[PDB]
Scaffold this active site. Structure first.
Site, mmCIF file in Angstrom:
data_model
loop_
_atom_site.group_PDB
_atom_site.id
_atom_site.type_symbol
_atom_site.label_atom_id
_atom_site.label_comp_id
_atom_site.label_asym_id
_atom_site.label_seq_id
_atom_site.Cartn_x
_atom_site.Cartn_y
_atom_site.Cartn_z
ATOM 1 N N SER B 146 0.877 -1.208 0.000
ATOM 2 C CA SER B 146 0.000 0.000 0.000
ATOM 3 C C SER B 146 0.907 1.249 0.000
ATOM 4 C CB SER B 146 -0.954 -0.011 1.221
ATOM 5 O OG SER B 146 -2.098 0.837 1.006
ATOM 6 N N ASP B 201 -7.939 -4.709 -7.158
ATOM 7 C CA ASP B 201 -7.522 -3.903 -6.039
ATOM 8 C C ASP B 201 -7.551 -2.459 -6.522
ATOM 9 O OD1 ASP B 201 -6.168 -2.470 -4.069
ATOM 10 O OD2 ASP B 201 -4.329 -3.636 -4.134
ATOM 11 N N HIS B 258 -7.701 -5.393 -1.704
ATOM 12 C CA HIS B 258 -6.456 -4.693 -1.408
ATOM 13 C C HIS B 258 -5.846 -5.182 -0.099
ATOM 14 C CE1 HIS B 258 -3.621 -1.255 -1.469
ATOM 15 N NE2 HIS B 258 -3.781 -1.285 -0.159
#
Ligand SMILES: *[C@@H]1O[C@H](CO)[C@@H](O)[C@H](O)[C@H]1NC(C)=O
Ligand SMILES: *[C@@H]1O[C@H](CO)[C@@H](O)[C@H](O)[C@H]1NC(C)=O
Ligand SMILES: O=Cc1ccc([N+](=O)[O-])cc1
Lengths: 269, 269
Positions: B146, B201, B258
């Site tokens: 991320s 995602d 995600h």
């Protein structure tokens, strides 16, 4: 160990149980398709499965759950949502018994579970009865994870022997009452209880034995780890009221093992 | 569709990247074993892996993570944690580009990732150099999920060319700059960047191309679903800057997709 068919059922009811938390539900009219976020319940989504009745924070115990109709599998499903914060829920857990001779003579249940149920039993009993009438052929199944597991088990014992069988699939349920109640749960006719557990889940170990609690037999114990996929081989059937060697073993318990029954549950991605 | 050897590496650094969120201690003395809650990093735990330095909220960007030594795999690992709440981060994510001629010429990078890295660059680069010295034959790897991935990509592009290769393994990283950067990211010598994404995602889709962002090539796209295990047959290498047909599809995205890179990541059971 357990059969493919019984495995499939374990997996599906793990999912209706997970759907009580991650269902994009409620405030959702009856007849809507059942769908979850986060791939939480894809076997339910594959079934032609729909809400019959949704409840949120009903009665004293603020109960949450849904009643579902499944035309693919021929089920009527009552799914009880466990708590929104399991951690605090476990922190605040009270160990008081209360009498419940109504369910069985000599029986005592966790007060609070039995109370939360009692408070919604008339509405829900009626809702189930309505669906049994509309589909006398369909199998009635109550399920839940955690607090959800508890409520499904209580509702089960309460509502059985009114003509239709009620099967119960519970995932990580706490103990729900005294040795007398456990005995009734282990023999009671008119439906089967499938009490599923995972590794060292903390929840099945509460309330502790010492406070006057017992577990029903048999126990369906998952031994593959957290975030590991489950196969039939891992699942171990364990016999005996309060038997040890499944979840009931002397080691440190774990909150994360509480959240992995066949897949993620008790929480939504 | 990828090699076993590469599959294994992708899996190992997804776990070092997961450890940045679930590893119990950002004030844990150097030298202690690396461990995680909730089975988030068992390949790490399985290696002789120890902390070298732990940072938390460091510098202007509040950057958190660790550097580890792994004697089993012979690695020096810098792991950047993503945001403590990803949905908010994703909501309050700024799309402004800044000049970064220091690294790439005519290349513009995202302002927040760039400044966040830049503000901790000196201490961290010192701590990698010290480890490269003591273990000259260990592979240096920067990794992250991320925000974590953005940062590792930025740090990698910044610290390469000092005489030790730096490999970067990113997971669900956002776009990090402009087309020139993308190119500079595609060809830079002195290491390999392994840009891993999952299904649909959302994070790798931000900031949008329509704000001047480009993605470096190639992409390692995981096609298997959320909560589904990954095998090497589930990863497809996609070639080309801003290639479409991997994660970069005109379909609609998903926050959950995600939090599942080989395993649970960006959250801790
Ligand atoms: C509900 O599912 C049924 C079959 O399971 C499907 O035919 C129908 O399109 C669905 N309704 C919606 C709104 O998707
Ligand atoms: C750290 O791990 C090493 C080997 O990987 C092991 O020998 C040692 O016991 C561990 N230390 C602790 C405190 O567990
Ligand atoms: O078969 C593909 C392949 C890729 C890498 C390696 N290796 O890195 O050892 C071996 C095989």
């Amino acid at each position: 160990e357990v059969s493919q068919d019984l495995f499939n059922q374990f997996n599906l009811f793990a999912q209706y149980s997970a759907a009580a938390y991650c269902g994009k539900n409620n405030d959702a009219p009856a007849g809507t398709n059942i769908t979850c976020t986060g791939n939480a319940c894809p076997e339910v989504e594959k079934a032609d499965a729909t809400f019959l009745y949704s409840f949120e924070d009903s009665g004293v115990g603020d109960v949450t759950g849904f009643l579902a109709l499944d035309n693919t599998n021929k089920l009527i499903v009552l799914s009880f949502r466990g708590s929104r914060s399991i951690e605090n829920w476990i922190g605040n857990l009270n160990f008081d018994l209360k009498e419940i001779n109504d369910i069985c003579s000599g029986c005592r249940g966790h007060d609070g579970f039995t109370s939360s149920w009692r408070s919604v039993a008339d509405t829900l009993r009626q809702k189930v009865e309505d669906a049994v009438r509309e589909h006398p052929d369909y199998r009635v199944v109550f399920t839940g994870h955690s607090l959800g597991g508890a409520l499904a088990t209580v509702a089960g014992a309460d509502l059985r022997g009114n003509g239709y069988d009620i099967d119960v699939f519970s995932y990580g349920a706490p103990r729900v009452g005294n040795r007398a109640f456990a005995e009734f749960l282990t023999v009671q006719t008119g439906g089967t209880l499938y009490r599923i557990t995972h590794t060292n889940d903390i929840v099945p170990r509460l309330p502790p034995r010492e406070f006057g609690y017992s577990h029903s037999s048999p126990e369906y114990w998952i031994k593959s780890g957290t975030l590991v996929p489950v196969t039939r081989n891992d699942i171990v059937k364990i016999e005996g009221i309060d038997a040890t060697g499944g979840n009931n073993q002397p080691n440190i318990p774990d909150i994360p093992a509480h959240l992995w029954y066949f897949g993620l549950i008790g929480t939504c991605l």
